[PDB]
Structure 1
Amino acid sequence: LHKEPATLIKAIDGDTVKLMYKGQPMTFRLLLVDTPETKVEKYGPEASAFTKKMQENAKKIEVEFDKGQRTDKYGRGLAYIYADGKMVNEALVRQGLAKVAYVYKGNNTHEQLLRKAEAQAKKEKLNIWS
């Protein structure tokens, strides 16, 4: 898997963000995470603000596709997003603002990493695990 540059256009929700990738606007859905929905579930606005702040304040945004299918049925890209080297998917789970989702079409390179982060957020009874 390799990282590619992208530019933030607009954060839409805790699990979805619009990015300029290879010159064209595109909607990305964060791989392996399930965040409370804003469109409004409990912690939804917290998750949304977290994702937004983390990406708006970064110097560099990179996208990393996994080895499985790259887009869902709605046309959104399926990827791990990094903000200044830190993976947003992982930060959300670690902070207890998302649960790890079921592996989708072979996209599970970081499932264990995220699983570990979630167990810890759980032990700490953070946010969602409150």
Structure 2
Amino acid sequence: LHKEPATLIKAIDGDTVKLMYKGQPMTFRLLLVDTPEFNEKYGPEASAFAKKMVENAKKIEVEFDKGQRTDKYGRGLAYIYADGKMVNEALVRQGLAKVAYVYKGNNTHEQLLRKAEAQAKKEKLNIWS
């Protein structure tokens, strides 16, 4: 996989964010994770964590997987990096997201994320508390 440039337009919630990619505004949905909706338990904390991450970053990057790059709602599907750290992974590692929506052929970082989930679960963090 390859990291590509993007810039932040606006934080949205734990697992979606608005970025400019190839010069065009798009909403990205983070691959392989599910954060709680803002209205649910840990939703506000997931949103806050994801917002801090992308707002503090000097460099945002988008990494597509091998399969579909847009979902049925026209959201981009990608792994999002903030100053080299994967947002998808960081949410999971903090117990603010579950590994989820693992579809065949867009699952390159599955085992990396499951390893983070296991560690979050072990330390009983947030969702796992």
The TM-score with structure 2 as length reference comes to 0.97
Matched-pair contact (CA < 8 Å) for 1:69–1:105: no
What is the correspondence of 1:45-60 to structure 2 with a 5 Å cutoff?
45-60=44-59
Gaps of 5+ in 1: none
What is the correspondence of 1:94-105 to structure 2 with a 5 Å cutoff?
94-105=93-104
What count of residue pairs does the alignment treat as equivalent? 127
Post-superposition shift, 1:103? 1.2
Matched-pair contact (CA < 8 Å) for 1:65–1:78: yes
Give percent identity, aligned residues only. Answer: 98
Matched-pair contact (CA < 8 Å) for 1:33–1:98: yes
Tell me how large the CA RMSD over aligned residues is.
0.7
Matched-pair contact (CA < 8 Å) for 1:46–1:97: yes
Cα deviation per residue 1:71-105 (whole Å; 9 max; x = unaligned)? 10000000000000000000000000000003125
Cα deviation per residue 1:18-77 (whole Å; 9 max; x = unaligned)? 00000110010000000000xxx0000000000000000000000000001111000000
Gaps of 5+ in 2: none
CA distance in 2, matches of 1:99, 1:51: 14
Following superposition, which runs of at least 4 residues in structure 1 exceed 2 angstroms of deviation? Answer: none
1:73 aligns with 72
Post-superposition shift, 1:129? 0.2
